[PDB]
Amino acid sequence: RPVETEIKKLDGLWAFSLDRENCGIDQRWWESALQESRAIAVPGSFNDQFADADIRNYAGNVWYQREVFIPKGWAGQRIVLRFDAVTHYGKVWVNNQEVMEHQGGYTPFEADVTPYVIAGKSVRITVCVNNELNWQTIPPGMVITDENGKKKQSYFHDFFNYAGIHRSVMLYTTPNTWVDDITVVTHVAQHASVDWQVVANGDVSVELRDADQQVVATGQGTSGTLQVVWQPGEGYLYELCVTAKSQTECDIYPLRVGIRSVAVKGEQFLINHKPFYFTGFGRHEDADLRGKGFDNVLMVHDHALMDWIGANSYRTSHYPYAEEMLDWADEHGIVVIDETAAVGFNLSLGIGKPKELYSEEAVNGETQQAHLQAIKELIARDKNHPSVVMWSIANEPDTRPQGAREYFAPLAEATRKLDPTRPITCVNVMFCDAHTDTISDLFDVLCLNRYYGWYVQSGDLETAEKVLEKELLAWQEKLHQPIIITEYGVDTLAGLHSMYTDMWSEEYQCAWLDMYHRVFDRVSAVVGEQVWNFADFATSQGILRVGGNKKGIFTRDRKPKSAAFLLQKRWTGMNFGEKPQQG
Amino acid sequence: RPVETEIKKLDGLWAFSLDRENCGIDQRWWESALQESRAIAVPGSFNDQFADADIRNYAGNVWYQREVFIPKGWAGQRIVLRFDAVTHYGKVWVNNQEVMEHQGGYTPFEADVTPYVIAGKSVRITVCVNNELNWQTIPPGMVITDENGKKKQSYFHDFFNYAGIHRSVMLYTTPNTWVDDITVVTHVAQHASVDWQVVANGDVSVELRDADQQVVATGQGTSGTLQVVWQPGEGYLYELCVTAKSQTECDIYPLRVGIRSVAVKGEQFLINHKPFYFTGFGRHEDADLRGKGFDNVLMVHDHALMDWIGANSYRTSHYPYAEEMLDWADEHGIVVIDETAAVGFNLSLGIGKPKELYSEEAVNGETQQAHLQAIKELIARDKNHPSVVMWSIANEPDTRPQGAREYFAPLAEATRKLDPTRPITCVNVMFCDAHTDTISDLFDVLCLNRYYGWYVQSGDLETAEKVLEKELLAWQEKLHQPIIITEYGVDTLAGLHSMYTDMWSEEYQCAWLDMYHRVFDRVSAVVGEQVWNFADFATSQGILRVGGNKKGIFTRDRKPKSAAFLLQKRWTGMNFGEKPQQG
Ligand SMILES: CCCCCCCCC[C@@H]1NC[C@@H](O)[C@H](O)[C@H]1C(=O)O
Ligand SMILES: CCCCCCCCC[C@@H]1NC[C@@H](O)[C@H](O)[C@H]1C(=O)O
């Protein structure tokens, strides 16, 4: 992530165009200004932006374009173009010359444009964004076509498939000796932090401070770095200046790092050798009007709501969040379970198609590879953050058909070898209980999604309590692992009230979140709770979604339901980081 | 009220017609079947019944009509036609002969039709209902006209002016020796119950039982009746059979009566020599679709809600309720403050006209007389009910202009002389505080309506608490009287939520009902609380009414807001009939 000692190109509006006939790449639309274009805002999903029904569901090729002035002060320095996130696929051109491409979507991609750019004159930038999903994209999907060439995309996750440019686009400048790769690992017993470095024609000189420039250690090398002697309450974080020296130019890069070591012991999650208890939300990158587009106002407000309601942790649910969320996350010291876009590997979640989930035509080969790629990138971007205490390879995969274990074992192995300093998990779906799941052993923490009283035993608390209890303590006796409930919630209309406290009413969300909390309290292995969704969010059209997913404690415009004050009483009434002693 | 030892004529549908040109009484519409009629349901207000905007606000003359068969078994007995309630004015005809008329509205009126009726053949019944209000109606109003003769009624109360036939119509039969008048007064020290009687050519023999026909006393005469030796929890009530004997026929009439004596001592309301604390609602005779029409299902459900929420008392707000509510009220033993339709005697409640409220053109002469009449009738119908512990002459009158005291003193005197066994009150408006009110001395209990934090000091709890406190203890030091707060509430949209707990949100209704309850708890003279309205109800069109009055704890279809559970926690958490010891 860039700092300096740049011109943020995401300012203002871009030219936006559709490619229904799919003429763009053939007719070389990037070598000219978009014919019949309209203004679009970055960052922001293109679907909700124009109130156009046909634009919202369009599946194909979209074209962004924007001219920019390259500042004169960057004469002999390398000019680099960074896209913090272009959702699903993007191919970037700089003034008649093709520079870059990436099929990531929720992770950045950058390219060196020093030759193709002459600092001082205006150059045009054309981005081709694709929002298609097949079986080798993360998350997976499948497109269908018919007569008239109308393309219709179908996917297997819940949230709506927003696309476009979702995070800032940067255009940064570094001297010809840059610090391309950095790694830092911290230890603590009852300690210090090894440092790393990768550069070109430059030596490494590492120093680190605390409050302000008050160095309290130092080191000269690409290893070791140990010296003098970060909490979930405040979050004390030192500033690690890295220096790369050359004959002519010098480079200085500041990296905030917090001393912490996370490890699992029996059925306890230890951050700095202390048992913890997770409370908070599994949220989404969703908002009114802008899709998954990032915005600072929303981050400030949502963090205010989480601070008020007593949440101490949350999970970047179902895709990598914007890194600003993680910088804030280690600033205010909130625990984060980071997760990849690996979601939807299941054909059993049917609103009420290949024949076997781990066949060749679906999830085999490039699917496993590209999943390992999403791992490699998520870790290569979020490795240094002290707020990240957990890895999460995938979310709710069907592990019942033949070949699921053969799929998930190598990913666990490679991911563990990539970052051994943090525990790893895989959130499993509800249809795979303790007697049918075959993957929960590969991972350090078991994550659970449970909806007893909603999908099954619908509306019956008296029996859903028993089934949840039996399933829970049966998990505990089965694997003797720390179990975090990462999804538990029920849909609720914001204004619907009912004397009988039946489903969809706020009284049922309150009484349903309560029983789950008692069963949570009488189980020793439950190392945390995360009510399903923070706020109501947009999903695809189905007969089970009443204008999106209504399982939020807050509405979409961030207004509280009756459960927000219940949870604010529960989480702030207990001691921070502690679980109730069975009551 | 009739029993026997009848044919309820309110069964099914009646013919309904409008009189826009005002031709009815002139062209003798009762002597024929209504030309161009449509089916209407009794009981039920005619305004909401047809979804017709023009029918709902129509101000003039409406015509009901229904043929009926007079049963053969009533050959030589007197046949009487009873209208339990015809709202505002009614003139009743029986088969080409005019029998009765009444300008009451919320009280019954009956007439002897033995000559005009021959039991065995069908007779027609035509009712002329008027919904107009001038300065001599209770409640008062004033009608305006223009070109095209369009009449437009304006009144000064809040609730909508529903009209029509609102309660059952009876057609009962009694032997030629009937018991026209009965009175019963009960005493209790640390006792018995004098009896009364009025008949024609019949002697009085009085006996009374308990559970079933188990007489535990007796008496032969029209006085005395004292013998052996009713609570707000259950409500034990004896059965008093009255007998009127003649040479040929005999009459037996059962009257339930509960032993109780209510009296005010200093600043305490004593029912059976015990200090009390009022909790509950000031409700309305309003419902979806039927206007003010009575219905048993609604009474059962609303009594279920009041029983659940912990209410022990309520006030028949702004008009005499249906007597079934009072029979239920003494059955389950709920305390009732009975009130007349005397409401709207104020020109200061302006949404933001004569010149002085007690002039001759407005409130003078027949206005005072007819008010005394509404008194006389309310007392003549609800005198024997043990559930009625209080008289309430009027509600929110402007007592600031010259001549208010000269108006209200004689009504208090005559009303006290009519029923001295129960305390009397007058609910005063907010604009007349302790330093400006001039009538609160005439009455036994002072009733208060207060809206600090809503109309004045809007949205500010920190100062509305001080103003409410100062006003309250200043009342206490001023008159040293028992003060019941009979109206305190704020409007609330059923589904509107807000993190800032500002006005119209459920959080503001909760936090606003709470502060009022603390200030209630630190005042010794407050002998009860009644949150303003039980359920949202229909009012006239104004810029302050969002589809009616939203100051209800429940919605109109009887669905709870966030305050219903708060009040259910407060009222059932305290001991029944007791006020918290300042906390
Ligand atoms: C026995 C299993 C019956 C069906 C259970 C389905 C659970 C699927 C959980 C789903 N997991 C994905 C999440 O985004 C969705 O919000 C959540 C949902 O349902 O809305
Ligand atoms: C200082 C006085 C400022 C204005 C206060 C007005 C209080 C009127 C109280 C009114 N009393 C009558 C009742 O039916 C209505 O529901 C209630 C209301 O407001 O809605």
Closest CA to A83 of A129, A124, A46: A129
Q: Beta-carbon neighbour count of residue A239 at 10 Å?
A: 17
Q: Does residue B445 come out as left (phi exceeding 0), alpha (psi in the -120 to 50 range) or beta? A: beta
Q: Where are the alpha helices (DSSP H) in B271-403?
A: 296-309, 323-331, 366-382
Question: Which of A499, A558, A560 has the CB atom closest to B560's CB atom?
Answer: A499
Q: What is the 3-state composition of chain B as percent helix, strand, coil, each rounded to the nearest 5? A: 20, 30, 50
Tell me if A476 sits within 8 A of A466, measured CB to CB.
no
Q: Whose CA is nearest to atom 16 of ligand 2?
A: B158
Ligand 2 pocket member B455 (CB < 6 A): yes
B144 CA to centre of own chain: 28
Please name the amino acid found at residue A385: H
Do A390 and A349 contact (CB within 8 A), yes or no? Answer: no
Contacts of A182 (CB under 8 A, 6+ apart): A196, A197, A198, A242, A253, A255, A384
The answer to whether B65 and B34 are in contact (CB under 8 A) is: yes
Tokens 């006005």, residue located: B503
**Residues of chain B contacting A560 with CB distance shorter than 8 Å:** 497, 499
Q: Cβ contact (<8 Å) for A555 and B499?
A: no
Neighbours of A149 (CB within 10 A): 10
Q: B448, B186, B185: which is closest to B315 by C-alpha?
A: B448
Separate counts of helices (H) and strands (E) for chain A: 9, 33
Nearest CA in chain B to A555: B497
**CA B91 remoteness from chain centre:** 22
Distance between start and end Cα atoms, chain B? 44
* Selected residues 308-337 of chain A with any CB under 8 Å from a CB in chain B: 308
A308 CA: distance to closest CA in chain B (Å): 10
Euclidean distance between CA atoms B162 and B539, whole angstroms = 9
Written as six digits, the tokens of B532 are 């303003």
Is the distance from the beta carbon of residue B449 to the nearest atom of ligand 2 less than 6 Å? yes
Q: Is the CB of B244 under 6 A from ligand 2?
A: no
- Cβ count within 10 A of residue B552: 29
Task: With beta carbons under 8 A apart, name residues in chain A contacting B561.
Answer: 497
Show which residues of B are catalytic.
396, 487
Phi-psi region of A362 (alpha: psi -120 to 50; beta: other; left: phi over 0): beta
Cβ pairs bridging A and B (under 8 Å): 28
Which residue of chain A is at minimal alpha-carbon distance from B305? A499
Q: Which residues contact B171 (CB under 8 A, 6 or more apart)?
A: B6, B7, B8, B9, B68, B70, B79, B80, B81, B82
Cβ separation A495–B494 shorter than 8 A: yes
The residue type at A214:
Q
A499–B559 C-beta distance less than 8 A? yes
Residues 473-532 of A with CB under 8 A from B: 494-499
Q: Which residues contact A576 (CB under 8 A, 6 or more apart)?
A: A232, A233, A312
Instruction: Give Cβ neighbours of residue B153 (< 8 Å, ≥ 6 apart).
Output: B59, B131, B132, B133, B141, B142, B143, B144, B161
Tokens coding A102: 């990436």
Q: Are B282 and B314 in contact (CB under 8 A)?
A: yes
Residues of A whose CB is below 8 A from B498: 559
Nearest to B529 by CA among B277, B183, B227: B277
Burial class (CB within 10 angstroms; exposed 0-12, middle 13-18, buried 19+) of B241:
middle
Q: Which helix (H) or strand (E) holds A317?
A: none
Fold held by B7-174: Jelly Rolls (2.60.120)
Q: Which two tokens stand for residue A108?
A: 């950045």
What is the C-alpha separation between A424 and A411, in angstroms, rounded? 11
Contacts of B115 (CB under 8 A, 6+ apart): none
What is the Rg, in whole angstroms, of the alpha carbon atoms belonging to chain B? Answer: 24
Give B420: exposed, middle or buried? Use CB within 10 Å, 0-12, 13-18, 19+.
exposed
Instruction: Give exposure, B319-331, as e/b (b: 16+ Cβ within 10 Å).
Output: bbbbbbbbebbbe
- For ligand 1, atom 19: residue with the closest CA: A158
Domain boundaries, chain B: 7-174, 179-262, 263-573
What tokens appear for A333 in the block? Answer: 């010291």
Segment holding A286, helix H or strand E: none
CB proximity B240 to A under 8 Å: no
Q: Contact B380/B373 with Cβ under 8 angstroms?
A: no
Secondary structure class of B225 (helix, strand, coil): coil
Strands (E), B42-149: 61-69, 78-83, 86-87, 89-94, 98-102, 109-112, 122-130, 141-144
On whether the CB atoms of residues B423 and B467 are closer than 8 A, the answer is no
Give me the residue from B308, B498, B559 closest to A497, CB to CB. Answer: B559
Judge whether B272 and B261 are in contact, CB under 8 Å: yes
Q: Kindly provide the b/e burial profile for residues A435-463, where b requires at least 16 CB atoms within 10 angstroms of the residue's own CB.
A: eebebbebbbbbbbbbbbbbeebeeebee
d(CA A376, CA B310): 61
SS3 A239: strand
The CA-based dihedral angle spanning residues A482, A483, A486, A490, taken in that order and rounded to the nearest 10 degrees: -160
| Helical spans, DSSP H, in B383-505 | 404-418, 461-479
Nearest CB neighbour to A498, from listed B305, B496, B559: B559
Length of chain B measured in residues:
583
Per-residue b or e along A185-207, where b marks 16 or more CB atoms closer than 10 Å to that residue's CB: bbeeeeebbebbbebeebebbbb
Which entry of A323, A396, A471, A529 is annotated as an active-site residue? Answer: A396
Residue B415 to residue B394: CA distance in whole angstroms: 12
Tokens for A255?
């990296």
For the B179-262 domain, the top CATH level (class) is mainly beta
Contact B555 A495 (CB under 8 A): no
Domain B263-573 has CATH 3.20.20.80: yes
Q: Within 10 Å of residue A271's Cβ, how many Cβ atoms? A: 19
Under 8 Å between Cβ of B264 and B444: yes
Atom of ligand 2 nearest to the CA of B532: 16
Instruction: In whole angstroms, give the CA distance from residue B568 to residue A188.
Output: 52
Return all residues near A551 (Cβ < 8 A) that are at least 6 apart: A489, A490, A491, A492, A532, A533, A536
**Length of chain A, in residues:** 583
SS3 A223: coil
Residues of B in contact with A555 (CB under 8 A): 497
DSSP string computed for A458-520: TT-HHHHHHHHHHHHHHHHHHH---EEEEEE---B-SS---TT--TBSHHHHHHHHHHHHHHH
Sign of the dihedral through C-alpha A78, A83, A89, A92: negative
Determine the Cα–Cα distance for residues B342 and B411; give it in Å rounded to an integer: 12
- Method by which the coordinates were obtained: X-ray
Distance of CA B552 to the CA centre of its chain: 18
Taking the CA atoms of A245, A246, A248 and A251 in sequence, report the sign of the dihedral they define. Answer: negative
Q: What is the DSSP letter of B2?
A: -
Cβ atoms of residues A184 and A226 within 8 Å: no
Chain A CB within 8 Å of residue B297 CB: no
Contact B295, B287 (CB under 8 A): yes
Pairing state between β B169-174 and B193-195: unpaired
CB A544 within 8 Å of CB A526 = no
Question: SS3 of A407, please?
Answer: helix
User: Under an 8 A CB cutoff, do A559 and B495 touch?
Assistant: no
Please say whether the beta carbons of B15 and B37 come within 8 A: yes
DSSP of B543-571 = TT-SSSB--EEE-TTS-B-HHHHHHHHHH
Q: Tell me the two tokens of residue A438.
A: 């075959």
What 3-state class would DSSP assign to A102? strand
Write out the H or E segment, with its range, that includes residue B243: strand B238-245
Q: How far apart are CA A449 and CA A428, in angstroms?
A: 7
Q: Which residues of B touch A561 (CB under 8 A)?
A: 497
Backbone angles phi, psi at A276, to 5 degrees: -120, 170
* Distance separating alpha carbons of residues A133 and A367, to the nearest angstrom: 12
Distance (angstroms) between ligand 2 centre and the Cα of A94 equals 69
**Contacts for B259 with CB less than 8 Å, ≥ 6 apart:** B186, B187, B188, B191, B192, B193, B230, B236, B238, B386
